[PDB]
C-alpha cells in the first residue's frame, strides 16, 4: 500500500452516516480518522482535490465522496479545568473555571 496524499480509490466496507452540524463529534473518511465538528465551509475546491490542510500540518477541510460537496473539519472548544477553592478550614464550596 501507500499513504500518499491522493484521491483514495480503494476503501474498506463501512456504511455512510448522515451529517450533523454545530455539535462537535469524532470523524473518519477516506482513511482519515480524527475528532472535530462538521459544518459547511466558506472555502472552495477545484474539482480535483480531496482534503485541505493548515499551518499545523493537520486536516481542516475534507470532501465527502458521497455527494460532491465541501466540508469543514475543526475540533471544538477544549482546555484545562481549574479549581478555585479557599483554605481547607474555611469552607467547603469550590468554583470551576474552564480555560
Amino acid at each position: 500500500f501507500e499513504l500518499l496524499h491522493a484521491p483514495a480509490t480503494v476503501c474498506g466496507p463501512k456504511k455512510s452516516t448522515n451529517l450533523v452540524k454545530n455539535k462537535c463529534v469524532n470523524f473518519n473518511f477516506n482513511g482519515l480518522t480524527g475528532t472535530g465538528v462538521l459544518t459547511e465551509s466558506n472555502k472552495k475546491f477545484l474539482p480535483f482535490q480531496q482534503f485541505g490542510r493548515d499551518i499545523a500540518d493537520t486536516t481542516d477541510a475534507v470532501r465527502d465522496p458521497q455527494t460532491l460537496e465541501i466540508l469543514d473539519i475543526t475540533p471544538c472548544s477544549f482546555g484545562g479545568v481549574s479549581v478555585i477553592t479557599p483554605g481547607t478550614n474555611t469552607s467547603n464550596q469550590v468554583a470551576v473555571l474552564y480555560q
Partner: peptide
Amino acid sequence: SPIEDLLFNKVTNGLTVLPPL
C-alpha cells in the same frame, strides 16, 4: 496618552496562551 497609543499601535495541537492578570 498619544505616546503610549502610538507605542501600542506599533506592536503586532493543544497549546493555549494564558491571559495576563
